[PDB]
């Protein structure tokens, strides 16, 4: 009872968190008080509710924990010029233009933590005309986002970039999982009215497989170089090429081009690319083929263990 907790009290999470304390607090006689925190470095591992390790505390401070009631957010860092030379073409944040198609992608992609967006419009009076989804309700559009943050931010962004009467549309049973059942209730409006409709989905996490045969090169090159190159391309760290996004088909020629771009002086003889479902058993040796095609709502990543190279 009757203890004051001063600001910048270094609180440490068990995976080397080193959180702080924002506002000084006095413990009430009830013994249950909530203190606001802030992390030290831009790179912060998502913590777990335990007894936070004590670094700096008063004579009376007993313990601190993380109850479920606490509400959390996420950081932002690692914005290299490569992301800029990729997002130049796509993230044309035409804030000046709202009722459009290229506007919605760019205005949604301004939301934090969002990785990629697709928006495909029908423009006709019949169903099943766009590249990869059904319609049901004609004269509408459907939106798919990846790496999605909490609902309200993307809901406001989506409602702020459309203008048509009823352009919202869930695709069909053959599409990404809807985020919410009936709607997303965008409560507030500039008109103060109680309008409520937002509909959007998320992609299907696929998985890809790559196997390539090469020559030995000018000198010895470990396979880790090739694995790192293909993984780095898949994540999208290279300039120009966005890598793999929501709605990008893996191509053996493109993967070979990325390998040549990273490590030159090697003679690639064979290239194979295959795609596998989520959690499915590893594809059989006969599954690989030259070219794979992915639909609009299919996202695929590549790990280090999915690329295996055996030179001649």
């Amino acid at each position: 009872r009757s203890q004051t907790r001063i600001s910048t009290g270094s609180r440490v999470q068990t995976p080397a968190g080193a959180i702080f304390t924002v506002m000084s607090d006095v413990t009430i006689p009830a013994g249950g008080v909530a203190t606001i925190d802030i992390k030290s470095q831009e790179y912060g591992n998502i913590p777990l509710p335990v007894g936070n390790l004590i670094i700096i505390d008063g004579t009376i401070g007993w313990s601190g924990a993380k109850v479920i009631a606490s509400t959390r957010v996420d950081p932002g860092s690692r914005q290299m010029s490569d992301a800029e030379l990729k997002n130049a073409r796509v993230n044309r944040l035409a804030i000046q233009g709202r009722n459009s198609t290229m506007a919605i992608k760019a205005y949604v992609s301004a939301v934090p933590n969002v990785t990629s967006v697709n928006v495909i419009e029908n423009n006709t009076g019949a169903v099943q005309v766009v590249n990869g989804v059904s319609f049901t309700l004609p004269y509408a559009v459907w939106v798919c986002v990846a790496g999605n943050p909490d609902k309200q931010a993307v809901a406001d962004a989506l409602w702020a970039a459309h203008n048509g009467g009823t352009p919202w549309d869930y695709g069909a049973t053959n599409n990404g999982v809807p985020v919410d059942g009936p709607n997303g209730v965008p409560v507030r409006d500039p008109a103060s009215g109680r309008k409520y409709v937002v509909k959007w989905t998320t992609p299907i996490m696929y998985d890809g497989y790559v196997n390539v045969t090469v020559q030995q090169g000018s000198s010895s090159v470990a396979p880790e170089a090739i694995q790192n190159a293909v993984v780095n391309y898949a994540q999208g760290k290279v300039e120009g090429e966005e890598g793999l996004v929501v709605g990008a088909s893996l191509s053996a020629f493109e993967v070979a081009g990325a390998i040549a771009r990273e490590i030159p002086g090697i003679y690639i003889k064979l290239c194979q690319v295959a795609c596998v479902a989520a959690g499915s058993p590893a594809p059989a040796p006969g599954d690989f083929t030259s070219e794979y095609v992915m639909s609009a709502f299919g996202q695929a990543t590549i790990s280090v263990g999915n690329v295996r190279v055996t030179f001649v």
């Binding site: 004590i54 700096i56 505390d57 004579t59 009376i60 007993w62």
Partner: protein
């Protein structure tokens, strides 16, 4: 107060008012450590003072040592009424009033000796006579004969 022990096995003495001993002085402030018994800062800048120390009990020369255990380790009272005398090759346990073993399973590995009467399972052993078949259920005459 210091209570020696580690690995979950300690020793304590029933201190009361008026007992003597020694007190040491810690290097820094230990209150923040004494609250949580973990790594902590010094509370203040006070150093090498008796305010935050450590007490060690002692009795000095106030005891009686019995003539038999003049060369054997003793754990006793001040007056030697109760003793646990651990000699070089034998042990002696002294208690003028009585002793108890609260263990629900005892064991021995050798010859045993008693010097007076026995009581087992609520009855006696120094006078026990078992009934027989002839005469019918008559008491075995006498008690405990070699």
């Amino acid at each position: 107060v210091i209570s020696m022990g580690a690995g979950g096995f300690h020793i304590s003495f029933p201190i009361q008012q008026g007992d003597i001993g020694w007190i040491y002085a810690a290097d820094r402030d230990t209150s923040q450590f004494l609250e949580s018994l973990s790594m902590s800062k010094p509370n203040t800048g006070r150093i090498h003072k008796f305010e935050h120390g450590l007490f060690i009990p002692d009795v000095f020369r106030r005891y009686t040592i019995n003539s038999e255990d003049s060369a054997a380790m003793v754990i006793q009272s001040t007056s030697g009424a109760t003793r646990i005398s651990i000699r070089g090759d034998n042990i002696k346990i002294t208690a003028p009033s009585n002793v108890t073993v609260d263990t629900p399973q005892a064991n021995f590995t050798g010859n045993v000796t008693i010097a007076n009467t026995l009581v087992v399972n609520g009855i006696n052993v120094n006078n026990h006579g078992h009934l027989e078949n002839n005469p019918p259920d008559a008491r075995t005459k006498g008690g405990m004969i070699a």
